[model samples]
Target: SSIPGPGYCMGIGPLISHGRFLWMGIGSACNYYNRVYGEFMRVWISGEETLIISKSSSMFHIMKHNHYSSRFGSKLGLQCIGMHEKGIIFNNNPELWKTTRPFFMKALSGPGLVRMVTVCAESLKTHLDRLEEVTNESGYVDVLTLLRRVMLDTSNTLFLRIPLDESAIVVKIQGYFDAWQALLIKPDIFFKISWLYKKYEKSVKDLKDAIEVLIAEKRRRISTEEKLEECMDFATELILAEKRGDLTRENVNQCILEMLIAAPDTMSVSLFFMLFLIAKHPNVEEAIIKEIQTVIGERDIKIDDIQKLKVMENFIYESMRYQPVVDLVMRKALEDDVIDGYPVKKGTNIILNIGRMHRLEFFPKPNEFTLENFAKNVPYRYFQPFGFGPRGCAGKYIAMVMMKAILVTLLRRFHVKTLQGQCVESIQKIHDLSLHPDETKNMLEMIFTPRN
Candidate 1:
């Protein structure tokens, strides 16, 4: 089992074959894998009874407008997928989803970001100090680990309003990584094992329980005056709105859980990928630092100050292009349709091979990661990391803000690098519904070359 070359296949037939009765569709192992690259492919079950089509626009079409009406749980069986049953991210497209989306949308709206920064800065500083403490004269510290905990600690405060005590953000970071890694193996294993279910059950319950407690606290203490100003904190705003009879408990719970669940992974993954990209491309890092220093100039960053960091924005856009966190957004089609001159049908599951889509075929010479990708020619909406259409991620703004915050601070104080002896390689993409890499093997070693 040596490392796969630029072009290789890892025997996927066994896995793909399980659903073969559905898809006499594509038989060859190469054809099955090639479907990963093709514009779109359809798999039809016995007697052509059911057909599932996988493509980008088709998924958006289904998830965006139609799923709730026609195609319910035909593709993924996301319903009986036990462990993720109650998780907000996996909830079915129902009245509950529609009820929840807008309340949290209002909560995370442009005005509410300020409350989270105090906590974000706190976590950022802890990592900075820890990184400084660990760097020897040679000045190599794992920037990947530094950013992971900072991202996690910040996520905890913003989402749950508490930090992981004693164990430090590092332990919580590692624990979730381990648990999520195991959980990724198969969508069904958790339903089979009692212990795994209980373990994750507790984690999910603890997080929801924490949110419920915050809601109760806000209900008891939050006042009219306080609500007016504190509508900026999402939980406060939701509670205040609910008290005003604007929203229901079901709506409030769903909104709270939606924000909490969607907050963590994208931020950490995007920031880590940025760390990787910036360290590799020093010129982009230098231009970004210059942009930051020119604008900030010996002052702390107020939220408004972020708007001036144009170079930093480009870097965020580029890093996402190079290695998108959720490689391809997943969706299920509701009814028969046609896309790019291909016939698509109802109950078709689509994989919008976004990672591959980002290559030179869609982008000019995509091999080289460059910040210029965000220029006038490239439409922001087209290069979607947070996705597009109705069902796109609700937490995109938070992810963008947190990514910029990490870079603004890092580029200002420390210059990052891959250690002299550390070998840099593309971490293999774990292709599924979501794409995450094993970044531990490819750490970002940063040195404190503080610019005076």
Candidate 2:
């Protein structure tokens, strides 16, 4: 690679070419490589070379084997949720992470989410019914709003063991979204502005109060009941752990709140993007229906049946790779290290450009929506919508099940389409806190026609 950029910042870097180029912003790294270098290159961000790992070999190694942690975003992330390192998401300390990670895995495991399928199905039906009613009256339904409501309801019931009024929680969720978006742009500016910082704190306060209320009621019910259910909801699992001296009340609160902050948006945005892509490609939608008809027929999706819809699985995988919900995965080095002979200082930040990497030459039909590529012999590490390595999302199984349950029911019972004449490509990208489309886009307006 060429020694690019001003001052001593330029070097024979491993991934990118310039220090000034690194600060061009979050999503610009893709353009920097494609237009400037025409291949993988390294750039100096401050004194360290910011190596952009596009290939699977280096990407897997950096994600899996590196001794790195989120020192910047995690702090701001915790601030948005109004807690210290009390829970799993922001806890960079290895010892604390060791304790919390297993607890999360157990709560969100395949068998664990399987136990909640019936509950989630019921919630999904209720929301779908409401959406159908609205669409009948208005001629179209805002898919984002409907999906957000359904996702929120499912998370509340399965995780909290109680259905909360969405009215009380929706605004707080928006606050979290806004705060997160701001943090991604400039965490320092977000912290310095008192008015902005206070708003973020208030979002945390509102969410904390609501979660505490649920925790209180759950405790009362357990103490009064003669026996607990054979399987516990997520909140109850944490409660029991606290009772056994494995965790504290604050830890339980933060864990619950972390789920609250994390679950709805990730699932909703992923599905939103998936539906947009499906609407654009009618054949893809047809394949989904045919796959369901063959695998499940007229029967509702059971926990065992989710994994059987291999076509739907490929569709979701392709959708995620095509339009990823998350834009970047970041880590701060704990010591001096070498990434394929690239010099990285102890305090350097390693930023993986997920959006750019997904379009690398290694992926078959990298820029197009090709479902067959997912069915082929593509490496598992090449597609990482949920993330990668030791800190991979614990809720991935839960998200998969929820997505299947929702899409299967909708596709089985009705014909879904985007608003007439709206182009799928019209949905403009917004790389604030997450990778998502502008809400004003008409492609989000869905019309549902009953199959029967």
Candidate 3:
């Protein structure tokens, strides 16, 4: 049990002594631990001793193992929906997760991907035109939330088959995400005084209730004859899943909620991060637009052209390596076991630091953002933007297509560049967790000049 780490305490003692608890918002604490105490370091979280794992082999072993397949022991976000254990991230019930997994796999299957590309590309086109009129006082448009709203509309239509009541759904989801940003940074006592905890709780409760309302309307629209043998929209069929005996009502509800929640924030942030990386690398941006023009050539983006844009694809792969959207993947041990030669007990919380793994020296010039390395020598094991194991992100393929379509559509239409020498790398990430560039500083803002 001689694991290298700080002494365990009741609350987050190490976090406070070292720095603000909020630093965990972007995994700086784990980076600090990795720098000081080595790859596997123990830290205190919610009265439990937790393992902060950064090493690749140890991380993969834990993820691929059945004993460590359970998601985070904590469940604060999403307003603690029906049964609380119903959805993917919070669900501890392995059987329900296994049973409903194929449902997700089928949802984004072949024809559905074409539907995804169509929705993503069309949504970006519609949203891009409005950016000029929607700028802030300094005339800079807020790309992250703008993308959030756009992706919200896209994901809602794709999954729920219902149009977003942008007034309610878009605003609530954005507020809910902002609420979640504040939700991460502290001890139990801090939340007692913070009003946001209650606000997001209500926000998500309303969000869930709103979906319940929409699903009822969606259910009514589906006549007996209209129920297709094949459903491209998973939520449409999840209603049928509940109607039959295969799944419970709560399971179906949580699954629907997760499907709705899955894409918007994560995908929007991913798209933003990718764009941010492109803005930071001036040469790469030039090369990307050149390749886009050469391959795509003043024409509308086609699904067929995705593989043809090899330079843009490699740039995104490199960006994901540099600024992966998912900060950490949490797991709880189901039984006692040893990992990386340290004795791990049952119920031990493990935080797999994705950022550290992506930034490892295994890649050439890992410290810098460059598409050059990915064009040649990126070891497959070190890069996992979509995550891994049996419980990794299921909508990854769908997300990749959506991202590529949107980015190509964006780059082909606009000449993207950083504002006043500002770049995403220079921004401080204080809000909404993950590695998302903090927009309050305006460093993340860029000028997107329309191509004539």
Superposed by TM-score, candidate 3 places the C-alpha of residue 3 at a distance from the truth, in angstroms, of 0.8
Q: Write the per-residue lDDT of candidate 3 for residues 191-254, one digit (tens) a residue.
A: 5675646666676678778888877777777654453765537786777777788887777877
Model 1 lDDT, residue 415, Cα: 70
Better of 2 and 3 by lDDT: 3
RMSD of each: 6.9, 3.9, 3.1
Best by TM-score: 3
Error of 2 at 362 (Å): 2.5
- Separate clash counts for every candidate: 4, 6, 0
lDDT of 1 at 286: 75
Model 2: per-residue Cα lDDT over 304-414, one tens digit each? 888888888888888878878875666666677666545666666555666677787457788888986686866667766676667777787777888888888777777
TM-score of each model, paired residue for residue: 0.74, 0.86, 0.89
Ordered from best to worst TM-score, the candidate numbers read 3, 2, 1
For residue 17, give model 3's deviation from the true position in Å: 8.2
Candidate with better lDDT, 1 vs 2: 2
Q: Tell me which residue pairs clash in candidate 3.
A: none
